[PDB]
Structure 1
Amino acid sequence: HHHMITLENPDIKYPLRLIDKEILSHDTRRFRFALPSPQHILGLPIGQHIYLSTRIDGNLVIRPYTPVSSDDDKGFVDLVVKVYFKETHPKFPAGGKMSQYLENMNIGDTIEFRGPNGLLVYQGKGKFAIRADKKSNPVVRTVKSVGMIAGGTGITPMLQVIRAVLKDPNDHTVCYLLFANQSEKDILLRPELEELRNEHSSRFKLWYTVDKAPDAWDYSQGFVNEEMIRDHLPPPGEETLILMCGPPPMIQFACLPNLERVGHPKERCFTF
């Protein structure tokens, strides 16, 4: 390890203290936790995520999250989270376990963090190091275009990569994002994404689709499909890599079969 990082060993749990919280909307939040010292950084390679874990209702619960902060930040880590409230959706009366646990924490409370984890690492300037599985060394490749399909909270792994590319004036990679959600209200981090589109149009293409469309809507409506893939993601080729993160059903039934029909091979698609 070159820098003074927090995630020194992936097999260790680090209890971090909650020091700030922001109400983004009725069901969205930003939670900020302190690192071991004001001079520490998290130590999370681009492409990887951390896990939070705690005991809830007498059972151990573990869930993955990709922070919105970066290794440029000293002393804290920021998470943006959608809270799934109980007795709000007829199909899920109990709501979400970890997201409700976070919403119920008091400033000063701690929660376990672990990482970095994930089979893909972006090394910059279009280079991606990917492991076939946890027991293999990574194979490196270079691409010119990165396609991205996110559904709901799956936007954070994409935003982390987008920002790493754009922060580097000399990175020529172009990112194409197709962001899908249940309704316009559920579009997480829209202001942040549109600020990036206005400042870096040449290296970032943005498009949305929603299941429930508002009367005034300029984008697509419906599940991710063949037409959307052809019109808003780069064409198949060795110079293209497609990244995906979203609900299992969306990835399995809406993404994979249409990517196949369009010509994107599985050796050139990765799911976070």
Structure 2
Amino acid sequence: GRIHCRLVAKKELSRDVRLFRFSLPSPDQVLGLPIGKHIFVCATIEGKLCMRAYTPTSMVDEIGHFDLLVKVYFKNEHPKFPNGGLMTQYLDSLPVGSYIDVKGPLGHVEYTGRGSFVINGKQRNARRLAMICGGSGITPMYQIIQAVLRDQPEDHTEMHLVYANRTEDDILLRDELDRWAAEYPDRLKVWYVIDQVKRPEEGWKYSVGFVTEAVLREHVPEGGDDTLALASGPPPMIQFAISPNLEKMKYDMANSFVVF
């Protein structure tokens, strides 16, 4: 359903990493979007209305505003299409004060009470989870995580996330995890993997490269019957290294391999 939010404010978290403050129309209510869903930000562009799915990441309690951290897809910086992209750039260029158009809640995943999941029709109850994200696919997962640890200490579920990302500096929500899953052990299991390691001198101890069975062995639990997987990332980073090795890792692919 539409809404008339607005660019209340902008905080470009780094190089090409935005932090958008689109407030609500009526600041007394929430962008009440069920944990398992996302908005379809409508910004009429070119001859289309570039409806791009997005899950803000901030707190559900937060009244009258919803936060979106973006990874802007700039120009003259990338082969195959040097250009970047109409919409994200457009969301950058877009100056504050300008009213946007939101659209919750268009999804399939959704977290019921403590532990269980409702899902595309059915619903499946899971104790320990598998969170092999990828890129800025952290947020739609964060949507589950934070909630799971807020509903604590009674939810007390297990999450073995695998923040798949491309480089050391490109670990978006580092701390919001790397602060969290320290004070909360048994609860969440963080893991960070990276192709390029900019500063060996910082001292890297997490994975170096991309998702492979060995990474998917220690950092991920057994599937069998009872464990769900909540993946998120570039399709190839799914066809060859999330679906195959996990297809072999005695887990269920059809019945529960979820993406968003």
Query: TM-score, normalized by length of structure 2?
Result: 0.94
Contact 2:4 2:24 in 1 (8 A): no
Give aligned pairs, total: 255
1:223 aligns with 2:210: yes
Structure 1 stretches of at least 4 aligned residues deviating more than 6 Å after TM superposition: none
Segments of structure 2 that go 5 or more residues without pairing to the other structure are none
Once the two structures are superposed, the pairs formed by residues 87-98 of structure 1 within 5 Å of their partners are 87-98=76-87
Contact 2:43 2:51 in 1 (8 A): yes
* CA offset digits 1:143-185 (Å, max 9, x no partner): 1101101111100011111101100121021111001111111
The one-letter amino acid of 1:223's match is: F
Structure 1 residue aligned with 2:257 = 269
TM superposition shift of 1:106:
1.4
The one-letter amino acid of 1:247's match is: P
Once the two structures are superposed, the pairs formed by residues 186-201 of structure 1 within 5 Å of their partners are 186-201=170-185
Match for 2:221 among 231, 234, 248?
234
The one-letter amino acid of 2:251's match is: H
1:142 aligns with 2:118: no
* CA offset digits 1:166-207 (Å, max 9, x no partner): 001210211110011111111111121111112212201001
Secondary structure of the 2:148 match is helix
* CA offset digits 1:216-253 (Å, max 9, x no partner): 31111222111111100111132211111111111112
The one-letter amino acid of 1:255's match is: I
Match for 1:179 among 133, 144, 163?
163
Instruction: Compute the RMSD of aligned alpha carbons.
Output: 1.3
Match for 1:42 among 5, 24, 31?
31
TM superposition shift of 1:57:
2.8
Structure 1 residue aligned with 2:230 = 243
Structure with greater helix share of residues: 1
Q: More displaced, 142-151 or 195-204?
A: 195-204
Separation of aligned partners in 2, 1:60 and 1:51: 10
Structure with greater strand share of residues: 1
